[PDB]
Design a protein around this ligand. Sequence first.
Ligand SMILES: O=C(O)Cn1c(-c2cscn2)nc2ccccc21
Ligand SMILES: [Zn+2]
Length: 360
Amino acid sequence: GASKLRAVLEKLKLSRDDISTAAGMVKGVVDHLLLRLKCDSAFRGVGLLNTGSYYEHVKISAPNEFDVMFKLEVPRIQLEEYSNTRAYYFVKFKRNPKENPLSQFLEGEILSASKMLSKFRKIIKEEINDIKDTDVIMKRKRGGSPAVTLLISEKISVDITLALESKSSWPASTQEGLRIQNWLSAKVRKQLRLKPFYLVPKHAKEGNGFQEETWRLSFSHIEKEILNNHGKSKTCCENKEEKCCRKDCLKLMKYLLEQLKERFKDKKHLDKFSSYHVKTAFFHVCTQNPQDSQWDRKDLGLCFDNCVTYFLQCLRTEKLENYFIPEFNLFSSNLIDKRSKEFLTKQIEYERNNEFPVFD
Ligand SMILES: O=C(O)Cn1c(-c2cscn2)nc2ccccc21
Ligand SMILES: [Zn+2]
């Protein structure tokens, strides 16, 4: 029902005002933090990376929650892949001169994530304590990559993550990734792959213990660009004759998962699932249907059923390739146990069989 779904989306559009006001409230604090952060010799080249659901224009239903990324430029780095993970790497440095301002964090030849995260939280703390014009508090440490967590005006929660920026060529694991050749063209793929890639501090788990000095690949900027320039036609969604329902589908998937996570928040089954899974699956569906005509607005129902159908498959086969790192499985049994996937499958299938009552 392309009408009921659009009723849901119209209902969703009402939150944009509050999400934008809160976004402004966040930006005000963030800019200050960055200006002050640029003072340290180590975090000199720190900058703001404007990516995420908000800048992708798909952020919904969470005004008091935000995620921001601080990017830092590392000139020349030698990357060492950790145990065929294809996504996690050790950061070494190409040259010998102590031009490196991060020499202080170098634990051996390998760059330590723990040390730099410590200095990051320390400086951020020292600076949030200084300003009293804005009621900003620093929350306790729980997460890994989203290392810093702030509370603005005792209302807004901001997840601050650190990211290294490398202008070098993308790692070999991304070779067969970003299959947009038949969709956004090969010229565009080449242009995009000429852009830098990022690394967020994350630990991998091979078993009982952890490796705490690893960095995981990040391409959020590429995701942003792909999302905000999503058509085979350059004038896609710029006129009435060329209006597609891609972003609508993504929004609907996100809302579906959100509602389902809210319905069973007390049972912890769906805790491991996030919106990135939905986004990834969506990108795969975009690759499957490269034509704008396959995303016509009038077919909003069908297209949505195409996305769900794919996502479900990913849940059943326990396979969801990272759109940039094909050999990395987001839905591997190591990451998410079968019981959770089967539960999510059960619920989604129920919803689809009862005309999505969760949409009302
Ligand atoms: O860090 C990011 O940019 C997002 N991301 C997630 C993820 C899982 S739940 C939210 N995000 N899993 C990944 C695995 C490999 C590379 C990137 C991955
Ligand atoms: Zn479009």
